[PDB]
Amino acid sequence: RRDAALKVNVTSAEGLQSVLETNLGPKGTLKMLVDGAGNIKLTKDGKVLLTEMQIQSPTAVLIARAAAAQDEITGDGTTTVVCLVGELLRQAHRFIQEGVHPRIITDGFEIARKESMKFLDEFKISKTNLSNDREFLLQVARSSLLTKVDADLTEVLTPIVTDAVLSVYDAQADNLDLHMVEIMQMQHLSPKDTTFIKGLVLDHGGRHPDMPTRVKNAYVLILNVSLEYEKTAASERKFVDAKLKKIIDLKNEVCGMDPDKGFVIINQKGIDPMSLDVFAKHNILALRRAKRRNMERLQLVTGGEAQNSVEDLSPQILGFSGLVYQETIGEEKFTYVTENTDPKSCTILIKGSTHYALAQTKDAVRDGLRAVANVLKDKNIIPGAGAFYIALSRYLRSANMNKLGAKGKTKTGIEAFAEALLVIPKTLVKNSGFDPLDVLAMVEDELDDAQDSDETRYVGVDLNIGDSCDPTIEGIWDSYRVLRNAITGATGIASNLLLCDELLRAGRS
Amino acid sequence: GQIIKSIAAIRELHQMCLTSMGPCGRNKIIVNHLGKIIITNDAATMLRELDIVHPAVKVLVMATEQQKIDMGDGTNLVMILAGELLNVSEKLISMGLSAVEIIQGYNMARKFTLKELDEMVVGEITDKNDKNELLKMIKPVISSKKYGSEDILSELVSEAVSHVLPVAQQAGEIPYFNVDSIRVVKIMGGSLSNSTVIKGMVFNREPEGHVKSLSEDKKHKVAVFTAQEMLDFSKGEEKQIDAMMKEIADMGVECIVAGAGVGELALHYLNRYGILVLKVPSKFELRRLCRVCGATPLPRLGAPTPEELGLVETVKTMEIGGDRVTVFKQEQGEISRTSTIILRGATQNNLDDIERAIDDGVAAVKGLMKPSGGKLLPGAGATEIELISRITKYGERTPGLLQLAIKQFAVAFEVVPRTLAETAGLDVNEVLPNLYAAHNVTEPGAVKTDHLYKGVDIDGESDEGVKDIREENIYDMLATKKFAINVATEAATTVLSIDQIIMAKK
Amino acid sequence: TGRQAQISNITAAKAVADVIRTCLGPKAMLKMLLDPMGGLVLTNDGHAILREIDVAHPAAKSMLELSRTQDEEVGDGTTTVIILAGEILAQCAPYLIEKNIHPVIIIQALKKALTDALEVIKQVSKPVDVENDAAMKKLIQASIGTKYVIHWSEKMCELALDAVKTVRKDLFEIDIKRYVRVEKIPGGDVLDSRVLKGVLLTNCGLFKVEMIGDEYFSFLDNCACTIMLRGGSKDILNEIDRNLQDAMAVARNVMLSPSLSPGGGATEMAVSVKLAEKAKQLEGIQQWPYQAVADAMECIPRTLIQNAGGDPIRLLSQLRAKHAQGNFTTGIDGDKGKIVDMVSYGIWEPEVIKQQSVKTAIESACLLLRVDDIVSGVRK
């Protein structure tokens, strides 16, 4: 007899949006995950939360798997897609349970789906990305960090992300996410003390404490064959001194007057500390046990080239760096090298107490650098601060005989979609303890006053004072391609539950 | 919780009454909490003694009262028809059809059936006092009622109705029919051939003092009534009773009727003066005694008024069923109607089924006299097959949602011919084409073809399937069929109208 | 046991048929499954549904092999044919377990029903010439309406119709179309295709080798055709074969049966109203189980009404009156549940679609009736 399982499956699924209800907006609280081994992670990322959290209802488990595609689509605040489809299902229970057929009402949302992109086509605003104006760049960083970290960490990571997005750029709009990868993770000082490094950083250093801690001009050269001998005893050490003679000759050949320059050695194997005493007089830095991935990035940044034998040395294969300085933290010595030959790749030095607090910054700058990268890739940006929740709901609310496109129950599906878009803005002020009914009087009703003035104005919602604001002044902006597949994808993901007649338990026995 | 639950109880009772109706029908045994054993095929008596714990199915139980008051026969036909209409409607419920068109479908087809009953009527023949007409009415009851012997029972009833017949030939305009005019007495022992009919009514009582006849008296008379200080009440009553009983004997009253407590001193003088007395008359016997005899039950213990007295031409107190019994036996000439029929049988349960069969035969005369006439209908299931062709035609004449209700309404008629096949153990699928072979494709140009003229009678003819009902005089009552479709439709729509069972402070 | 064992077999196919009622048409719904292992499979295709589910009813296991036979011919829309086999089992409830009708008597009635069905199939026969490429183009696009590749089918379905006609020709016309070799190239745009007539590896025009990450290009001049498909995505190649390689059944069915029948479940409408008229002329004992088959024929189009959210009782009143009076070319719109006839609906299906549907249904229904009971625990 009929189905009756649809209302039961969604009822168990409604518990997912209730848990994620407080995850929306910058006023939300972070969710904590803990395992049986003692590891504890605190983050708002839906990919990590939905993966570790095991829901007894299998219906909400399969829907959580669809959030994996939201990484490239959005990556920051993917909970909005989950909370948008939660009330979208509840609006159907007021209809389908009354005798409305699911397939009939589904076509109503399918029409409003494509029509939402047509309204969004004229709703988007385009900017000039060739000028590289820092006014708009700092705002995009605020649209992310404020929704991730507090205001104290906001002014810290904002110039860090701003300098990172400007490091990779071109007049042809050439951007590569794989160009900037390495991010230093250290436990020390506090998460507020993190800084932006202008070059690559290595996790290994020399065993000689007397090496110069600051170098003006350093020449980076990758050495393949190990400087120290391995196995076939007095003739074995004479071969090392013969190799050190070429290093001393190369140091004095390049610059033979003022000792304002230095040379860097990268070795795959260990180096005898007794041979490092000669480098103290020549101010030559040496390394050992360097990974292959670290050496491959030096040729594209420092400008060096891997050399096998030290008998043939030329300045053509020697790179250079503008600033080099080293710092010894604990028993692990690190080398900070910036201003290289090709300084298009940088690193973000992140320090803190433990990995518990470090996971907040790592996931924030990872997607934050990609979110601002889409602004340079796609010049069209969508006004944030909840400006398009009321706008897209108002265009489909007023239809009459002008633009409708549906009839009967399909017409009610468009009206149900307009009410489904208003659950997010009512939730943003609900997490802060504000009444969403009074907010619409100063926000939703304000758009009607500006409409009679023959002017296009987009008004946002300020969560601090619980009043209206300007997304341009506040600086909250979202990319066009981020919300394009998010709104369209939300209809397809929610359809999977709408297209399900009943849940039958059966399978391989 | 109701429909599916009731149908489970409906299919139960429907299968029970399915084997009750028909000449091959079966009986059942019902034992109450007191241990009383009753064997009858009547559905009204069946459900009356049974204790049903399902309030939903009780609609069909109370619906029998409408049939017993209006007619009293065809009770098995109503329970089979009403039970089948709710069984065939189960398919429409699973299809999603609301009860609005289902109730309207049965009510629309009910009015169409009444229009066909007036067009399909045959055999007027309009004769009240013929002994053959009394045989044509009492013979068909062997289907619903006891089929054991229709030869002897039909003769005793025909002679009894003609004996109590008011006559008044041509137009007498005779009101006030007597249902009590027919009475039977159960006598243990003997066969049915020993049964006979008496011009007077009989009852079971035994004489004591006299046993003498006294009916030879040439217009006799009968009356009907509604330490020395310790002997003051004793001798006072002996002088009064003697004077009261002597004045009755002086008037020549051979028998008196005493409906009150009779003391020892009263019976003492009755043996000396030779006066018969009745011992403790019941309520129904007291009413029949004053109306037939025409005497006033004077409560005064003294001499009754000699002007108004009872009279019996011929009465005998001798043995009847082997024991001496004083009865009311009389002669139609000088006294009124309400004779009796004496039954003889070994099994007391078989005499009860004959009593219920004869009581339904009284309603056959009621159905003729009260309306213009009882008319006739094709018997042995031949009426339902005539309606199947009519109801099917009405489905095409009225296009709409009623076609689903009209279709199931015609299919429900298949239980009547299945009743004859199921009770006889024969395959209903073999007899089914023989039933359709009567009307063939269409009806021939002749009037009253094998469809109307013949019918279904299965003894040795099960291979042929068709038999003439005119020579067999197998017919159905018209007033019963009119009331059958009315009770079945009212009961079927009542069950569909049930929503939820309500209990108040219990 | 006995008749009680057959009741469980009727409900076994009835429970499975009720799930695939919504699996037909462009409005077809989806079904979610939960296995004891915890995996979920959500799809609208009943092929993978019957394969993954292990049923405890022995009668439902026979439908798994029947689905493989129906999917071997076409596979699109033929999965719901099992409903017809389930409606006949439920139609025997007033007869088999009530009137005590013998199964062979029902089977003998199905033999006359299958014979009379083929006569009705020849009544809706609408032959069409296969030489017109525009007429055959809209024919293969019939099954495309259930997918989003509709506007993509312009550069897709044209490659399938031209390749089959090369390997079909004549002999009758029976030939082997399996000599075609289809190559799929991941990545790129779906609009990019390769037109090649010959054998992929006298007076050859030219010889060249392109650049492809998979393999090189080689031409062989004969005195046989291959297809190189470039998909618009990575995993889209699975759906491309369903709209092209699996669509070759349309080109095979039009060559064997050039006639056309109403598409989208509109064929059995004229069959059910005609079967009821042929039953009145039988006039026999088998007439009742023979006429009751038409009641099982009208349950199939109700799936569209259940998908269109209409009332199957009230809507079919006017729909069945059009096929039994006006003409047999009328049909039912599956999208909106409307009376629009198949003339303007623009979709027609070959007769063999319903021929193999009814043939495999009657043959599967009689075998289920020939089973008296089911026993277990033999420990083979």
Numbering used by the authors:
A (entry chain z): 14 to 245, 263 to 539
B (entry chain Q): 26 to 251, 270 to 549
C (entry chain g): 16 to 186, 196 to 225, 350 to 371, 436 to 592
Copied sentences from the primary study:
The TRiC/CCT complex assists in the folding of approximately 10% of cytosolic proteins through an ATP-driven conformational cycle, playing a crucial role in maintaining protein homeostasis. TRiC is an ATP-dependent macromolecular machine that facilitates substrate binding and folding through ATP-driven conformational transitions. It consists of two identical stacked rings, each containing eight paralogous subunits (sharing ~25–40% sequence identity in the same organism) arranged in a specific order. An individual TRiC subunit comprises three domains: an equatorial domain (E domain) that contains the ATP-binding site and forms intra- and inter-ring contacts, an apical domain (A domain) that comprises the interaction sites with target proteins, and an intermediate domain (I domain) that connects the other two domains.
TRiC-ADP-S3, comprising 6.0% of the population, appears much more open than S2, seemingly in the middle of the transition from a closed to an open ring. Further structural comparison between the S2 and S3 states suggests that, in the S3 state, the A-domain of CCT3 loses contact with its neighboring subunits and appears mostly disordered. Meanwhile, its counter-clockwise neighboring subunits, including CCT6/8/7/5, expand outward in a coordinated manner, with the apical helix retracting up to 18 Å. Close inspection of the structures revealed that during the transition from the S2 to S3 state, the CCT6 subunit drives the consecutive subunits—CCT8, CCT7, and CCT5—to expand outward as a whole. This movement propagates to the distant CCT5, disrupting the interactions between the A- and I-domains of CCT5 and CCT2. Consequently, CCT5 exhibits a pronounced upward movement, breaking the original E-domain interaction with CCT4’ from the opposing ring. Simultaneously, due to the intimate interactions between the stem-loop of CCT5 and the N- and C-termini of CCT2, CCT5 drives an obvious upward movement (up to 10 Å) of CCT2. During the transition to the partially open S3 state, the density corresponding to the CCT4 N-terminus is not detected, most likely due to the conformational dynamics induced by the dramatic upward movement of the subunits on the CCT2 side. This indicates that the CCT4 N-terminus may retract into the inner chamber to participate in other functions, such as coordinated ring opening or substrate release.
